[model samples]
Target chain A: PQITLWKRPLVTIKIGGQLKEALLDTGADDTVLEEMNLPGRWKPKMIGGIGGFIKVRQYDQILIEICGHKAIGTVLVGPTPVNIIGRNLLTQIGCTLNF
Target chain B: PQITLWKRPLVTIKIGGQLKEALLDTGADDTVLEEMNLPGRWKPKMIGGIGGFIKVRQYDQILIEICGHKAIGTVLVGPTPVNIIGRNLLTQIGCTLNF
Candidate 1:
């Protein structure tokens, strides 16, 4: 997919049977989302943002569909102001940087 | 310039005769910099981020060099935890999203 530079590269994603718009954040290493429920084993971890760090629950084996592309991977659920689809999931969908 | 998705896509930028590394944030609409001194006319404008709003000094006719590409435009200086090169300035350097 190609997007113009004037707007945020946000896309609709389906996670845990819920639909949400998330920013395609290539700057971030991991996907961070607002507080959500995900069943199964999870490890507590902290992710740093522009302001600082936030404690999050790293839920593995989460199924996320980004722009119709399905990716089963880790999704961090926490107190994020916005849902961000980071490089972790972006790579699975073949995302790239274009000039 | 081509950049990997794994990295922050951080680049060296020169503003107000100072060099620093800033994140290439497509999610941001306007460039926000840390406190800096710039000559000429400026106005106080508030910009909203992920957390909240921040008061910034928007300076016009300022010189900015992004990855060796020079662009003269408006720059907002404020108390930000991280410097971000937003879409406002990215357009001047002809940036686009590719995946």
Candidate 2:
């Protein structure tokens, strides 16, 4: 199975069996969700970007489905500007950015 | 000609005839350069993202070469965390994200 990441790399994914849209952000190290409700043992973490840093709740071993491919990985919940699929999960689903 | 955006979408480009590395950020609305001196008429603008926002000097009609495709478009000069080739420039080069 292959994921056709088009124009902006915006991808449709399933988290906690709910449909969600996430940006494929290779620049990011971990997946960040915006105001999502998921149950897990999470720890406080901070992520840095061009402007500054934001605190997030980092949770591990969360099941995610990317274009039919499934993986159990880490997910962060916070006030993200956008939902992001980071390089870590990109590796899990064998996601690629092509010509 | 096709530009091969890889796993991370980190690309090599030429701006003002000077070679530099840039991230192909679909999320970014405009191209941004880290402290490049390009002569042009510019206006002060603010760009927002995950962390917050940054004040930038927006210069229009700057010549930029992505991979091998050339384009004349807007290029913002600022103290950016990373040099980013935004959607505006990506469209000019017929760039796409694929898997």
Candidate 3:
């Protein structure tokens, strides 16, 4: 089997506490945080959408670094166990995805 | 009253079709795409978690432009209306957030 290489570059981000590695995805439009993994007080907020208002929790801020660049942002805690690295910082560094 | 400037940078991403203008969230660990905004066939998959398996749909591959850089990746279509910019693509760029 032949392997195909990704045309674009892969960026890495570091999460504070325990998480060591995370990936950057352009498909996701919102910031998602793992509710189970976060430490501290996270208040759930009602997220309004076309269907209705959905309950969401806010998690602690994490230190994220990509392509040697870094920033801090709030994470939306979800019931899921996995954490996602979004474009929140990518856009500032002049990053984009080519279809 | 004094205003505090965000120490981190805000990144912007462009979605295909009618949907435009998405913010990069460092809080999100995964890529989330809007089901209502995407075009073409999307297959739902079971997302296993601590609670149970949640149904998720796969959407069309969109061309994402971040900070002038672009890449093509598969979007995880959710029933919700808003899309999330996740770390899947951000990790490739070596980006990080500082708290």
- The chain A TM-scores for the candidates, taken one by one, are 0.95, 0.87, 0.54
Relative to the unseen true structure, what is the C-alpha lDDT of residue B69 in candidate 3, on a scale of 0 to 100? 54
Supply the TM-score for candidate 2: 0.85
Q: In candidate 2, which residue pairs clash? A: none
Judging by TM-score, tell me the better candidate of 2 and 3: 2
Q: What is the TM-score of each candidate against the true structure?
A: 0.84, 0.85, 0.41
Per-prediction backbone clash count: 0, 0, 66
Stretches off by above 4 angstroms in model 2 are A1-8, B1-8
* Docking quality (DockQ) for each candidate: 0.50, 0.38, 0.10
Q: lDDT per residue, candidate 3, B2-66, as tens digits?
A: 11112233355665634344444334444565554566777776543223444567654567765
What's the true lDDT of residue A40 in model 3? Answer: 70
Q: Order of all candidates by TM-score, from best down to worst?
A: 2, 1, 3
Better of 2 and 3 by DockQ: 2
- Model 1 per-residue lDDT tens digits across residues B1-99: 777676678899988788999988776777888887787889998876545577889988788999988878778889877788888888888887777
Please give the lDDT score at residue A53 for candidate 1. 69
By DockQ, the better pick of 1 and 2 is: 1
Compute the lDDT for candidate 1. 0.81
User: Alpha carbon lDDT of residue A48, candidate 3?
Assistant: 42
Which residue pairs collide, candidate 1? Answer: none
